[PDB]
């Protein structure tokens, strides 16, 4: 649960992430598979990078990064009201790519560093603390789909 003015934080925040989505995404999951290397395990097409140079060097992976932050902004521009759209999402990462609920916990971590690192200075004590509740929120509605499905 979060206030109005906790919202608009998230949505002032996510504008940075609008104006270069692609290279915002290619860094979370950067951050994601050098920081947590058994999550890159999960991808059949992006088992097969070795080295970041690869990873960073990679169109495939820019573009998935595109694909999975334009999902989580859709969810938070719904300021919390968003169960047509993270039923699908967490049906299919428990059920599909059996994704656990700690690797939503990896990058829920990774997308903070990379907005301090992306925008240092610039990503305040108060958008960090809104950002965090933000992606808890997302988490925590997921991790209740998982328990009704049973899936660890
Ligand atoms: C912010 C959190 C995330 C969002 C919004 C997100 C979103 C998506 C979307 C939109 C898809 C494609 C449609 C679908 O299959 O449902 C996708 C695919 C996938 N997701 Fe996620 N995802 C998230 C986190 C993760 C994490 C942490 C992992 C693994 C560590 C992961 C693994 C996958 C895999 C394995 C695919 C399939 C890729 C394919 O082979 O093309 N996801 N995700």
Same mark, same amino acid.
Request: glycine letters at 10%; charged letters at 30%.
């Given at each position: 649960? =979060?206030? &109005?003015?906790?919202?608009?934080?998230?949505?002032?925040?996510?504008?940075?992430?609008?104006?270069?989505?692609?290279?915002?995404?290619?860094?979370?999951?950067?951050?994601?598979?050098?920081?947590?290397?058994?999550?890159?395990?999960?991808?059949?097409?992006?088992?097969?990078?070795?080295?970041?140079?690869?990873?960073?060097?990679?169109?495939?992976?820019?573009?998935?990064?595109?694909?999975? =932050?334009?999902?989580?902004?859709?969810?938070?521009?719904?300021?919390?009201?968003?169960?047509?759209?993270?039923?699908?999402?967490?049906?299919?990462? %428990?059920?599909?790519?059996?994704?656990?609920?700690?690797? =939503?916990?990896?990058?829920? &971590?990774?997308?903070?560093?990379?907005?301090?690192?992306?925008?240092?200075? &610039?990503?305040? %004590?108060?958008?960090?603390?809104?950002?965090?509740?933000? =992606?808890?929120?997302?988490?925590?509605?997921?991790? %209740?789909?998982?328990?009704?499905?049973?899936?660890?």
């Amino acid at each position: 649960g =979060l206030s &109005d003015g906790e919202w608009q934080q998230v949505l002032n925040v996510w504008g940075k992430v609008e104006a270069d989505i692609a290279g915002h995404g290619q860094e979370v999951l950067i951050r994601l598979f050098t920081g947590h290397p058994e999550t890159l395990e999960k991808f059949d097409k992006f088992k097969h990078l070795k080295t970041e140079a690869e990873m960073k060097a990679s169109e495939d992976l820019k573009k998935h990064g595109t694909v999975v =932050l334009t999902a989580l902004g859709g969810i938070l521009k719904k300021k919390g009201h968003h169960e047509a759209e993270l039923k699908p999402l967490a049906q299919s990462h %428990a059920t599909k790519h059996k994704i656990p609920i700690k690797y =939503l916990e990896f990058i829920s &971590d990774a997308i903070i560093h990379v907005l301090h690192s992306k925008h240092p200075g &610039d990503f305040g %004590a108060d958008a960090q603390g809104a950002m965090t509740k933000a =992606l808890e929120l997302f988490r925590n509605d997921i991790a %209740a789909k998982y328990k009704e499905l049973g899936f660890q």
